C-alpha cells in the first residue's frame, strides 16, 4: 500500500545510527596540528591556443602531458614543461564537456552534449590521431569519464546513470542506477574498484565496479553537486555544490565530516581536487577565483585570482608538483 | 626539442586556420543522438544551429554550454496544462540565469482563464496590426508578446536582448544586430 512510511522510518534508522557514532567533529580533534599558513601559489604557465571556453582537463600519469577539452571542438594535448602542443584533435561534436587521459598514455577520451564517449588513438602505426572507438548507448549528455585501463572506462551521464564500458567491443558491461538527478562528476578510487558519483540531487553514491550495486549514499548538501574528488587514501572524498559550500565525507564513517563555507562566498563550486597528501582542498568557484581550503581546519588558506572567467575545471598532477586550472576565458593556468 | 618546436608550429598554423573559420561562424541554440547539427549559409555568413535531442527535461546544467552563442532561438507554441505559462517560466529562468544574462534570446512565437489581465489589456502604439487581422486575435498576440517583454525588461543586469517575432533572414538580421551591439559595447559606446 504505502511503502514510503517504511522508507522514512528506515531513514530515521540510518540517521540515528550515524548520530550514535558521532563523538566529536573533525574540527574538535584537529587542534594539536599547526595551521597550514598562507598558501601563496603563483601562476607559472599560461597555455594559450584554445578558442572557446574550456570545460575539462585531465593530467597524465607522467605529470607533464595534459589534455584539455574546450567547446571549440578541439582536444589539445599540451606539454606543460615547454608549453608546446603535442596533438590537436578535431572533434565531430564541438560541445565537449569532459575529457580523460588514459594512464597508459596511448588513448584519450572525451564527451559532452553528444551521448557518446569517443576514444582517440594516439599510438597509431602511421602518425595520425584517429578515432579508435565511439561508445554509444547513453541517453543523456556525457558529464564525466575516467579510464579504468586501456580497454575499460567508466562514464557518467545526465540520464542519472553510470556505465562501465568495454572499449574493444563497445558494449556496456555494467550499468549503475539509483541517482535521481543528472550525474555531474565521478572520481575513481586509488584501487579503481570503487568510485563515487555526484548528481543533481544533493547526493553522492559509492559504487562497486565489479559488483554493480550502490553501497553508500551521502546527504548533507543543499544543492546540486557539481564536482567530486576522492581523498588520496581512498577512504574519504570531497564534494562541491551549488550552495557555495564544500563538504568532506568519509566512507567507513558514513557521515559528513567537515563543512567548508564562509559568509562572503555565495557562488557555487565548479571543480574540486585534493593535494598529494590531502592537507589542502583546492576548489574552483563560480566567481573568477579559486580558494585553497585547509581540509583539517576549514579555514581558507589562499586564493588564486589569475583567471578572468569562472574556473570550470581543476587538476593536480600525480606527483603533486603543479595545479592546472581551466576557465571559461579559453586559458589554462599552471600554479605552483 | 626540435621536433617539438616543428610540431608546435604546424599545430599552431592549423589552429589559426581553424580559428578564422570558427570566429567566422554563427552559433545558435534551438529550444522548444545527443545533439543535432544544422549548418546553413546566408549572404556567405556561416551559421551553425544546434537542436537539443535525447536529453532530459532538467536543463539547468547542460544549458550553460550555450552562454557564448550569438543568440538562443526560443520557440513558443503561442497557438490543457497551460503550456504558455510553462514557456513563460522557462523564458523567465533563462533570462535571469547568471550565465545567460549576456546571451541574447530570439523569441519565436508560433479565454482569460489563465491570465485575467487580458480583459483590461490595451493594444499599445508599438503594436502594428498586420494586414488582414481581426482586433481580438491581434490583441491576444501582442498580449502574449508583452507578457514576454515584461519579463524581458524586469532585469537591469546583463548584456542580453530579446527579439520577438510572430524565417532565416529574421535570425540573420537579429544576429547582425547582436554583433553590432556587442561591438558598440566593446567600445563603451553602448
Amino acid at each position: 500500500d504505502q511503502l514510503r512510511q517504511e522508507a522514512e522510518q528506515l531513514k530515521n534508522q540510518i540517521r540515528d545510527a550515524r548520530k550514535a557514532c558521532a563523538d566529536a567533529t573533525l574540527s574538535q580533534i584537529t587542534n594539536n596540528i599547526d595551521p597550514v599558513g598562507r598558501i601563496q601559489m603563483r601562476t607559472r604557465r599560461t597555455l594559450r591556443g584554445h578558442l572557446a571556453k574550456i570545460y575539462a582537463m585531465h593530467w597524465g600519469t607522467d605529470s607533464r602531458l595534459l589534455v584539455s577539452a574546450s567547446q571549440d571542438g578541439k582536444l589539445i594535448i599540451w606539454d606543460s614543461y615547454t608549453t608546446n602542443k603535442v596533438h590537436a584533435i578535431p572533434l565531430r561534436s564541438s560541445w565537449v564537456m569532459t575529457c580523460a587521459y588514459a594512464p597508459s598514455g596511448n588513448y584519450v577520451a572525451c564527451g559532452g552534449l553528444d551521448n557518446i564517449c569517443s576514444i582517440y588513438n594516439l599510438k597509431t602505426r602511421e602518425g595520425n590521431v584517429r578515432v579508435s572507438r565511439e561508445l554509444a548507448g547513453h541517453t543523456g549528455y556525457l558529464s564525466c569519464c575516467r579510464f579504468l585501463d586501456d580497454n575499460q572506462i567508466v562514464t557518467s551521464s545526465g540520464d542519472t546513470t553510470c556505465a562501465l564500458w568495454d572499449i574493444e567491443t563497445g558494449q556496456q558491461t555494467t550499468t549503475f542506477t539509483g541517482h535521481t538527478g543528472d550525474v555531474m562528476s565521478l572520481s575513481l578510487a586509488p584501487d579503481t574498484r570503487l568510485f563515487v558519483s555526484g548528481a543533481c540531487d544533493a547526493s553522492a553514491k559509492l559504487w562497486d565496479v565489479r559488483e554493480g550495486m550502490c553501497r553508500q549514499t551521502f546527504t548533507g548538501h543543499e544543492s546540486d553537486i557539481n564536482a567530486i574528488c576522492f581523498f588520496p587514501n581512498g577512504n574519504a572524498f570531497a564534494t562541491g555544490s551549488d550552495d557555495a559550500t564544500c563538504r568532506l565525507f568519509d566512507l567507513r564513517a558514513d557521515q559528513e565530516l567537515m563543512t567548508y563555507s564562509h559568509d562572503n562566498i555565495i557562488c557555487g563550486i565548479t571543480s574540486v581536487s585534493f593535494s598529494k597528501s590531502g592537507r589542502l582542498l583546492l576548489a574552483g568557484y563560480d566567481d573568477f577565483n579559486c580558494n585553497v581550503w585547509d581540509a583539517l581546519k576549514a579555514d581558507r588558506a589562499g586564493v588564486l585570482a589569475g583567471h578572468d572567467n569562472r574556473v570550470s575545471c581543476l587538476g593536480v598532477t600525480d606527483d603533486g608538483m603543479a595545479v592546472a586550472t581551466g576557465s571559461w576565458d579559453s586559458f589554462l593556468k599552471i600554479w605552483n | 626539442e626540435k621536433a617539438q618546436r616543428e610540431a608546435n608550429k604546424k599545430i599552431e598554423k592549423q589552429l589559426q586556420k581553424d580559428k578564422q573559420v570558427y570566429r567566422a561562424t554563427h552559433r545558435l541554440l534551438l529550444l522548444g543522438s545527443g545533439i543535432f547539427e544544422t549548418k546553413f549559409q546566408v549572404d556567405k555568413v556561416n551559421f551553425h544551429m544546434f537542436d537539443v535531442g535525447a536529453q532530459r527535461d532538467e536543463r539547468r546544467k547542460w544549458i550553460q554550454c550555450f552562454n557564448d552563442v550569438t543568440a538562443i532561438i526560443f520557440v513558443v507554441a503561442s497557438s490543457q496544462t497551460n503550456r504558455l505559462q510553462a514557456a513563460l517560466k522557462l523564458f523567465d529562468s533563462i533570462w535571469n540565469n547568471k550565465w545567460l544574462r549576456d546571451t541574447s534570446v530570439i523569441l519565436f512565437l508560433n479565454i482569460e482563464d489563465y491570465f485575467p489581465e487580458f480583459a483590461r489589456y490595451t493594444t499599445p502604439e508599438d503594436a502594428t496590426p498586420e494586414p488582414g487581422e481581426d482586433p481580438r486575435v491581434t490583441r491576444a498576440k501582442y498580449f502574449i508578446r508583452d507578457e514576454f517583454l515584461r519579463i524581458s525588461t524586469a532585469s537591469g543586469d546583463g548584456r542580453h536582448y530579446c527579439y520577438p517575432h510572430f524565417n532565416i533572414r529574421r535570425v540573420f538580421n537579429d544576429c547582425r544586430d547582436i554583433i553590432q551591439r556587442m561591438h558598440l559595447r566593446q567600445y563603451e559606446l553602448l
Partner: nanobody
Amino acid sequence: QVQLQESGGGLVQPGGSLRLSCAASGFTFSNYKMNWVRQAPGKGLEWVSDISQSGASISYTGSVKGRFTISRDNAKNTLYLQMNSLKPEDTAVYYCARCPAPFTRDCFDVTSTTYAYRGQGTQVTV
C-alpha cells in the same frame, strides 16, 4: 537532507476554503526561493505560485491569482498557501517545490519530472 514534507489537503466543498502547510528542513529556508506546483489526475505538472526569499516578490498563475495566497514564515521554516473559493478543477496533488540555486533570480526545473528538492505532495480533492 531536503525533505519538504507538506501538510493539509482533503476533500472540501465547492467554493470552500482550506490551507496547506509546507514544512521545510535540511536547508536554510531564508536563502532559497519557494514554489507551489500541482499535478491533476491525467495531466502534467503545473506551476501554481512562488515567493522570493525576502517575501515581497510574489507571483501566481492566472487561474489562482486573487483566490489563493502565498506566504512564508522564515522563522519556523514553513510555507503557507491559503486556499479560498476552490473549484473542482483545483483537484490535484499539490507539491512544495524549491529550486536548488540559492541567491538567484532564475529558478529552474521546479515543474520537472524526476526532479528532487520537492515534496511528495498532498491530495486536495474538490
